[PDB]
Scaffold this motif. Structure first.
Motif, PDB file in Angstrom:
ATOM      1  N   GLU A   2       0.819  -1.215   0.000  1.00  0.00           N
ATOM      2  CA  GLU A   2       0.000   0.000   0.000  1.00  0.00           C
ATOM      3  C   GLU A   2       0.855   1.268   0.000  1.00  0.00           C
ATOM      4  OE1 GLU A   2      -3.607   0.154  -0.224  1.00  0.00           O
ATOM      5  OE2 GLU A   2      -3.010  -1.850  -0.850  1.00  0.00           O
ATOM      6  N   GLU A  15       0.409   4.106  -2.860  1.00  0.00           N
ATOM      7  CA  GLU A  15       0.135   5.519  -2.612  1.00  0.00           C
ATOM      8  C   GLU A  15       1.191   6.411  -3.242  1.00  0.00           C
ATOM      9  OE1 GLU A  15      -3.456   4.999  -1.041  1.00  0.00           O
ATOM     10  OE2 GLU A  15      -2.448   6.907  -1.411  1.00  0.00           O
ATOM     11  N   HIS A  52       0.398   6.738  -6.822  1.00  0.00           N
ATOM     12  CA  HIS A  52      -0.661   7.731  -6.997  1.00  0.00           C
ATOM     13  C   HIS A  52      -0.103   9.144  -6.961  1.00  0.00           C
ATOM     14  CE1 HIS A  52      -3.684   4.611  -5.196  1.00  0.00           C
ATOM     15  NE2 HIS A  52      -3.101   4.195  -6.308  1.00  0.00           N
ATOM     16  N   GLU A  61      -7.414   6.499   4.264  1.00  0.00           N
ATOM     17  CA  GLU A  61      -8.001   6.313   2.935  1.00  0.00           C
ATOM     18  C   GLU A  61      -9.168   7.266   2.698  1.00  0.00           C
ATOM     19  OE1 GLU A  61      -7.229   4.872   0.249  1.00  0.00           O
ATOM     20  OE2 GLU A  61      -5.655   3.533   0.957  1.00  0.00           O
ATOM     21  N   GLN A 121     -10.713   4.970  -5.303  1.00  0.00           N
ATOM     22  CA  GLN A 121     -10.914   5.238  -3.879  1.00  0.00           C
ATOM     23  C   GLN A 121     -12.140   4.508  -3.338  1.00  0.00           C
ATOM     24  OE1 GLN A 121      -7.759   6.312  -3.254  1.00  0.00           O
ATOM     25  NE2 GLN A 121      -8.845   7.165  -1.487  1.00  0.00           N
ATOM     26  N   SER A 168     -10.922   1.097  -2.679  1.00  0.00           N
ATOM     27  CA  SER A 168     -10.019   1.108  -1.528  1.00  0.00           C
ATOM     28  C   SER A 168     -10.770   1.316  -0.217  1.00  0.00           C
ATOM     29  CB  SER A 168      -8.958   2.194  -1.704  1.00  0.00           C
ATOM     30  OG  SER A 168      -8.061   1.836  -2.737  1.00  0.00           O
TER      31      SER A 168
HETATM   32 FE   LIG Z   1      -5.299   4.169  -1.191  1.00  0.00          FE
END
Ligand SMILES: [Fe+3]
Ligand SMILES: [Fe+3]
Ligand SMILES: [Fe+3]
Ligand SMILES: [Fe+3]
Ligand SMILES: [Fe+3]
Ligand SMILES: [Fe+3]
Ligand SMILES: [Fe+3]
Ligand SMILES: [Fe+3]
Lengths: 178, 178, 178, 178
Positions: free
Chosen positions: B58, B62, B65, B106, B139, B142
């Motif tokens: 994760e 991130e 992203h 999140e 999202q 997630s």
């Molecule tokens: Fe995330």
């Protein structure tokens, strides 16, 4: 060309205190081997088959480490001296207690290597410190691994259900954090 | 042809408030990354290897992203401004508490995207709302996923045996309802 | 069995000055990561796609190095302490100037490792010097590589034609002397 | 069931101002197509074969976009109205100047889509905004791409040697930052 104490051509003499300390470390590794065998048996006696298989493999591994050290002495033209091997501990009140002894045995094996390493440094024996470097690296991963197994067993807090789950992990080859 | 603030040919000017809000969202994503790394470490410290591997992945996600957002600013001929990154939270009393912070992080990341989205709508920046659409969709999944992990851990009710079972699920890649 | 500061079984205590220096080196690696990301962005802004891809990969690599160090602290039963991360440099007048900063950042990363190494030697922490050995070796090749890229860019002497040729080399994966 | 202006069953009426704006956008795309063909020819006349192949493909792509819009009008049961197509620009003093017109044509195509999008929003035509979303996303990547080609050509600063290098990149399919 000079001959070493074991009869082979001698590339460089070794200080007798360093020789003695390597010979003793071989005993440490042999003793860890029979200790892991004793632990394998204790686990088999309690039907913890995953722990039994793990320690059976660890006993074989420690013996390979011992033999690896006997080969280094041959390569340095030094004599080996295989010693009397003490009887292992064989009784524990719980798996948590066994794993505590297991972790301490791994850490004690590293301490022994470190002691050999420091004496080599004192003697400026660069062949020996180089030889020991990958073995210390493997000890770091073994310490990490035994800390993982010990901590996971301690987390179980003596619940048989959790100890069965961990046992099945080990039987599956899940023995490290990954 | 006009040049944008970063020097490239400029397809359409961006309002400075929207630019600032995107640059800040990049910080939000970078902060989530180091937060998931901190969570990965906490789990590794407690031998929860499955949770450790999940959060390690994760943290990398991130960060991807964040980089994806820096590429959008390049594509819009806008300047990036990589900011000071605060230290993550690093201590939790339980895995349930960690997963609560994880879910909130999140959800907070989605809120940040929504804030950028609303400002783009105010500015009629259709490139940005289109760019954000698949990211909001991710999202949603997630949030669904972290709600699943949090709820499953809460269901365990602090029983180490159940937390070991869930840990093994995560190590196996079973991280969503499916 | 003693417990380490992070809660795991402790194979051998670590001097707090060495712990602090490792934690700070993790920050150095994290800072190199965001610096290479900033450099990736600068190159992308000037359509130097090969340099952009190279530094994008380097940012990911430096982050992996940082995480590798956090795993060593876990393995030693020491606490991590992820720190505030300063903002990277983001402006350069030329690619030659960027590559100069890049080389200096690599060399500075090695200096940080060397400082940790010397403190481990002072403390006779052989696990840490062994752990650092392959990382110093990788730094030698990274320094060799960044000296190659810097020197090749300097050889170009600011001619856009030569910088395009080098850019295409990097996009092709030709990033070292070979 | 009502019939739409083109004779098919009508799912929902379209405001005539939105219909007119879509029909005009089809002309914009058709005009970009013949413009990229004119640019393809200019490049072929100067032996810039890579740029010739790139713009030849772009002319075909823009035409596909136009046809994609005619299919949407069919799907909405609206009439198409294929219009007189103006002659393209055909003369440029340099490749840099051509690429400037190319970038502006891409950006102008996006502006046209945005204008259609805003009118759909005013009319609450959610089918049309949804239909346009992936097309705006593709425009972002096309703008990014044309900014890359324009900037790379500008970096060459009119040196024939660098323009040959870029030409060979394009012939190889290296047309984006990647
Ligand atoms: Fe995330
Ligand atoms: Fe051993
Ligand atoms: Fe061992
Ligand atoms: Fe994210
Ligand atoms: Fe590094
Ligand atoms: Fe490096
Ligand atoms: Fe088009
Ligand atoms: Fe286009």
């Amino acid at each position: 060309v000079a001959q070493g104490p074991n009869g082979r051509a001698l590339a460089e003499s070794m200080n007798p205190d360093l020789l003695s300390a390597i010979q003793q470390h071989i005993s440490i590794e042999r003793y860890a081997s029979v200790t892991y065998l004793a632990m394998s048996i204790w686990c088999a006696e309690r039907e913890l088959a995953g722990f039994y298989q793990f320690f059976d493999g660890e006993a074989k591994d420690e013996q390979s480490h011992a033999v690896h050290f006997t080969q280094y002495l041959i390569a340095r033209s030094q004599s080996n001296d295989l010693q009397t091997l003490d009887a292992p501990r064989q009784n524990w009140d719980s798996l948590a207690s066994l794993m505590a002894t297991a972790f301490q045995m791994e850490a004690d094996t590293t301490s022994s290597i470190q002691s050999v390493y420091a004496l080599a440094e004192r003697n400026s024996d660069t062949r020996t410190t180089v030889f020991l470097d990958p073995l210390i690296e493997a000890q770091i991963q073994s310490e990490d691994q035994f800390a993982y197994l010990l901590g996971r067993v301690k987390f179980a807090n003596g619940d048989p259900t959790a100890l069965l789950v961990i046992d099945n992990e080990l039987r599956a080859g899940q023995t490290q954090r990954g």
